[PDB]
Design a protein around this ligand. Sequence first.
Ligand SMILES: CC(C)(COP(=O)(O)OP(=O)(O)OC[C@H]1O[C@@H](n2cnc3c(N)ncnc32)[C@H](O)[C@@H]1OP(=O)(O)O)[C@@H](O)C(=O)NCCC(=O)NCCNC(=O)Cc1cc(O)cc(O)c1
Ligand SMILES: CC(C)(COP(=O)(O)OP(=O)(O)OC[C@H]1O[C@@H](n2cnc3c(N)ncnc32)[C@H](O)[C@@H]1OP(=O)(O)O)[C@@H](O)C(=O)NCCC(=O)NCCNC(=O)Cc1cc(O)cc(O)c1
Ligand SMILES: CC(C)(COP(=O)(O)OP(=O)(O)OC[C@H]1O[C@@H](n2cnc3c(N)ncnc32)[C@H](O)[C@@H]1OP(=O)(O)O)[C@@H](O)C(=O)NCCC(=O)NCCNC(=O)Cc1cc(O)cc(O)c1
Lengths: 139, 415, 417, 417
Amino acid sequence: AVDGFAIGGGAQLLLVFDRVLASSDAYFSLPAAKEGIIPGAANLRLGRFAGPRVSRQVILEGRRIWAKEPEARLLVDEVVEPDELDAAIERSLTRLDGDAVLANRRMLNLADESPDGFRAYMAEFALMQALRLYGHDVI
Amino acid sequence: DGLWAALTEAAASVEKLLATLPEHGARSSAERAEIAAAHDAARALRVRFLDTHADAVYDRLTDHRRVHLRLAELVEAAATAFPGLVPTQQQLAVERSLPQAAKEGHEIDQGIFLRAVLRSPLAGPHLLDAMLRPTPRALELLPEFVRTGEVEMEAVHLERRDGVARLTMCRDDRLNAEDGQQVDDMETAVDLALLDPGVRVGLLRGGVMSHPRYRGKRVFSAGINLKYLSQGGISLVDFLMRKELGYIHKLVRGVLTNDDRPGWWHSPRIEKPWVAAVDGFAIGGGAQLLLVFDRVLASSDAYFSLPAAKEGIIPGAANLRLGRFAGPRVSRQVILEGRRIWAKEPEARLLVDEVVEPDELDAAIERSLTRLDGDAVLANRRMLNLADESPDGFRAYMAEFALMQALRLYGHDVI
Amino acid sequence: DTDGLWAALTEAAASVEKLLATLPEHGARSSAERAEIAAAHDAARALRVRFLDTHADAVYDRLTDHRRVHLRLAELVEAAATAFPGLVPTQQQLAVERSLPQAAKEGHEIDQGIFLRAVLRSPLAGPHLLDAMLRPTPRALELLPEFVRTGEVEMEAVHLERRDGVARLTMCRDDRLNAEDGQQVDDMETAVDLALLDPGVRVGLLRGGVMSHPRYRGKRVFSAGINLKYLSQGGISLVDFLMRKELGYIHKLVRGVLTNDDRPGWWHSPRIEKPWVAAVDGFAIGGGAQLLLVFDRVLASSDAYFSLPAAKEGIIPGAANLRLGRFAGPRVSRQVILEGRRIWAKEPEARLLVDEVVEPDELDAAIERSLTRLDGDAVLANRRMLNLADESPDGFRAYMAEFALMQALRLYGHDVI
Amino acid sequence: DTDGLWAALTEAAASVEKLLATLPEHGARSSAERAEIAAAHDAARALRVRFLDTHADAVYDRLTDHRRVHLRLAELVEAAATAFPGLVPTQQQLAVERSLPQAAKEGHEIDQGIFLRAVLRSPLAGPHLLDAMLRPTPRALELLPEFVRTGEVEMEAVHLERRDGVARLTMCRDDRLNAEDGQQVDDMETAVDLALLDPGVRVGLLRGGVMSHPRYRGKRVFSAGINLKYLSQGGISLVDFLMRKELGYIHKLVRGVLTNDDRPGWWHSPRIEKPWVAAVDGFAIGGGAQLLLVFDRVLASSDAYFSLPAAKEGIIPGAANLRLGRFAGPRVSRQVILEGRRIWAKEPEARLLVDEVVEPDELDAAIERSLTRLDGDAVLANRRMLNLADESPDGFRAYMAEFALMQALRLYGHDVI
Ligand SMILES: CC(C)(COP(=O)(O)OP(=O)(O)OC[C@H]1O[C@@H](n2cnc3c(N)ncnc32)[C@H](O)[C@@H]1OP(=O)(O)O)[C@@H](O)C(=O)NCCC(=O)NCCNC(=O)Cc1cc(O)cc(O)c1
Ligand SMILES: CC(C)(COP(=O)(O)OP(=O)(O)OC[C@H]1O[C@@H](n2cnc3c(N)ncnc32)[C@H](O)[C@@H]1OP(=O)(O)O)[C@@H](O)C(=O)NCCC(=O)NCCNC(=O)Cc1cc(O)cc(O)c1
Ligand SMILES: CC(C)(COP(=O)(O)OP(=O)(O)OC[C@H]1O[C@@H](n2cnc3c(N)ncnc32)[C@H](O)[C@@H]1OP(=O)(O)O)[C@@H](O)C(=O)NCCC(=O)NCCNC(=O)Cc1cc(O)cc(O)c1
């Protein structure tokens, strides 16, 4: 559930949950673009959520999607006024209970992101990131 | 006929129980029920008298539509020339002293009056024309403003620059929360802006806020001051009416000037294009005004509402305009169900023109003012308004408002 | 008299009077026999107009003791018939007419059309006749007390109910998909009237009940429009249905009912008005979808649509021509009306007439939460203000004037049938 | 008459007449000499107004034997000139004014603007001058028979052609991408009267024919704005084009043509109207897109765009300021009219001027299939009732009245040139 805002790792995590809720006053970004480091596994996942086009407007040009703009539905599931977010949230948890969800979830992930896919990506990350750490402009 | 005195004994009885009874708050139940019944018979009579004698009453107060009188002036003049028809200065004074919760609702009479006046195809266009003429305090500070280029006033901060009359809502305490003193600095900011030959385009925005929840950030407006509302600080006439017949109307049609300066035959009114920029949010009157500018800009983090729906009062002339902006369907989701359109949701484009990130709003705004310069804009603007909202349309609406609002003022739940 | 028209008209008709009297019924109609009856009619109706263009207010003043007695449509046209023979059909003529094969009638209702129009075009009569069809009907004034004590009233077309401060109206014609006719128009006005008066009703509700016909069994439909049956046969009445609907209850939903100078606060609120909510199941077609443009809040179920179908050969769909515009734009409206387009609840342009489009298994819940959001005494004030800005008393009056003679024309235009 | 506002005016026109006749030719004039002649015009025009605010109906009654003779714009202003010297330019002065460049003209048209504005504000002469403009023109009337015969007219601008009940208009001006001008407007109205009085036509269609200019060779092109070069050069007549085309043919596409009490049913339909379908190829700029705001069905190509370019330095974009808001809302219409926005065929908001958008490949078949959906009778009785609610008689006239003098002032505004 997103209150206020999801910037950076905050946003990165939203690409791994089964259901994302956010109050209408929210927005999301990774706006480390011109100087910051690589935003984790976002470069690996944001693609499958909002295409290569948006994916780059976000991560490369530093754009941010506002909770209420149409394109926010590529990342979030539900968007409601903060003074009803609580119930939106509760009524949410009770919908993913059954063991039917455990199975379907599990297959869906097997399709979205696979073992080789994550491994290959995390490999290059290990180094790429290192270097991006000790890089003049990020420092 | 003999309607007058009829009305008179009516205000008579009322005047009576106006002393015999104990302070409001300790009456009972044929105590209350009796004053209440009284008033009704009186106000009921105030109406019948005016339905047939408004034009007369108006003619006597203005030497037959020969002297333009602003709202305050007109109602006052009405009081001393027709005791019982509308409250006197002092009478109101007693009222304003008490808290909006315990008043006898004497404003409702001004509501019944001002209504009948605007309902006439003779008096109404005149009371209106009269509320379009430059405000004295404005003609007072004009020369000083023209030479200075800067006028500092409690709620508003005017400033001419590059041909722009930039107004800046600066309640560095209270989120520009409107109040009948702002409605004054505001109507003066507009006039000066319109009469300053050096101004071509107007700009309305919010200054930086001092309050902790918003220190260092601009805020457009938080609607009306809910506080003074309960306390008895929101004048039906001096604020709620003066507001819609005063500056807000000027932003549409301009300042009715005196036959002086070449062109008056084709343009008795000086109008200019205005541009509103929204920072943070436009709640209430803040939002209401956005339905009258030539160009609205807003940072992507903004939203708008009038979310007085289940208890509050009528949101000004919104009920009259929001329709033409977003259909009867949305119009009601906003005003009736209390919904708010977020700057970035698609439906925000029914109200705003441009929406950009706050760290580029400044340029979006500048590049905006330079686009409404030519005299081609003055003409096209003027015709567009003639189509969108017409004279009869506004008059009819403002009429019923005069009363409807009055009553919505002294209504249990709003209080 | 002086004018002269009253005699020209009095004779012009006198002619038709005879000509009809002599010639046989229709179809026998030798032949250009008709061209004569034709011309007779045209010269007569042409005269009915000129007379009223200059004497409507008078004629109206005599029928209502100078705008001093409120008379409903039926009453007014009847009163007109006996006091100005030739101007408008008599209870009898209409009888003869209302018992023939629509496609073979002289078209006397057209006379009723020329009257309703001139009467509404007048800024004198106009307001008065309409404030007369603001006023609550007798049937309801009569039924009110039992309603206040019971909270239940089973009528033929509608089923009224008071539950939780909500006037639940339920168009219940399951045999025809809530078709349309004078009894329906009579039950709806009565029902609406009862709602508006019941000091126990804060908000109104209109939904269709479950249908019993085999095509849509178990489910419920909002309305399937005007009963075509009864228009073919003849006999969708121009005055007891078409005009009544628009000036009576449909207009009450917008301005409330007009009460006598009884209660305290009349001087300021002569009419009792409350918000209304309409929920759509299955569909609204025809008159049904016409109503949608008068409701404060509106729900439909995902899998329905809204259309006014008669594009190429039907009639005029009431005030949908004065209202759709304000709702979806000049192109939308001409699409819906002129080219019979249909809109589905789940398509974008649907949010132009619908406030919420909710899965059928969730509709009950949505409806119930909306009835709880239009409570206040502010919502009543903001409602009255908004309707004033949308549909000014004048615009409506004007549109109804022409509609009465135009719908009348369309009600007989040979093609219609 | 007695209040002698006329002698003031008369008196004033002289001070102008003297100053001109005794001061050097325009550009030869000194700063002071400029300020003086200019001061005289203002005092004169200022007086032209005051006189008419109180005597328009009179002046109008004398020029038309008390609203008893319908006179078109040209006729009326001419008649006004000879019967009230000083009120409005004579044919001669208009002749001279034309001889020069916009900006050495004394701007006499402004007077015709003050005149036309006074007449239209009058609830008496207003609707009367407007009915005279709806009457069919002498040229059209002249050609009505040969059109009924041949089924084809071919004027310098348009090219009319009956075909299946369709009055196919085609603004063929390949030389200029169909830039409006004085003649173009004449043929347009003639072409529209023809389509309206020819019983053979049921549905009219406006479309731009193939171009002949190298840049566009081979492609059809709806419209490319008003003929500029004349705005520079002095061909745009405030009356014979700007006003005519609004009060004339463009208004006939809405209400049709007012006939005489000839054929039967005139008592209920004094005007003959029919549906229209414009089709946009390439683009629709200026006056062109102004036309789309009154059609019954707009077809547009995929590559087409719409705009009202007369933004920064120009003249009012026609009754567009009266209609645009109704199709796109106050924030649309200003973006388009004030800021100069341009709407493309394939973008979302194009659906709020256009009904269909199809690839040039198939636009041709599409236009056809729609030409056969407005055939109906209700499609006349729906059309007519929609246009009444869309744009009121008062509403339109109010606009026109202020347009006449606001636009007259634009022709001469310094920027425009
Ligand atoms: C805007 C808010 C949501 C901000 O929430 P926060 O971030 O929670 O800030 P807050 O801590 O609440 O407020 C910041 C600060 O501003 C003050 N503030 C905020 N809103 C107001 C208003 N409306 N008045 C006065 N002071 C205000 C608030 O009191 C705080 O100072 P403190 O009380 O000392 O703490 C909140 O302030 C709020 O809900 N205000 C209610 C807004 C409102 O409902 N206005 C009602 C509008 N109703 C009309 O305009 C009616 C109207 C107006 C007209 O002009 C004409 C007409 O015909 C009809
Ligand atoms: C709704 C439908 C599409 C349903 O299709 P199906 O699922 O195919 O059901 P059906 O088998 O056709 O009909 C089910 C059932 O309802 C009956 N039914 C359905 N519609 C009607 C109508 N309109 N009248 C009478 N009975 C009807 C139908 O006759 C069936 O019973 P049977 O005849 O014995 O079989 C169909 O019934 C239909 O097309 N109805 C036409 C709807 C229509 O065009 N109404 C016209 C509306 N035109 C107006 O309201 C004009 C108007 C009304 C006003 O109120 C005011 C005004 O000023 C103008
Ligand atoms: C359409 C264009 C963008 C086309 O660009 P291109 O492909 O670059 O073609 P061009 O080479 O410029 O023009 C092709 C050809 O058509 C001629 N042409 C194009 N537009 C015009 C106009 N408006 N007038 C005359 N001739 C024209 C142009 O002069 C060329 O011939 P040449 O001059 O000999 O070369 C261009 O022609 C253009 O910008 N025209 C300006 C369009 C314009 O602004 N019209 C102004 C509209 N303003 C109104 O209608 C105001 C109005 C009209 C009314 O009817 C009523 C009313 O109340 C108010």
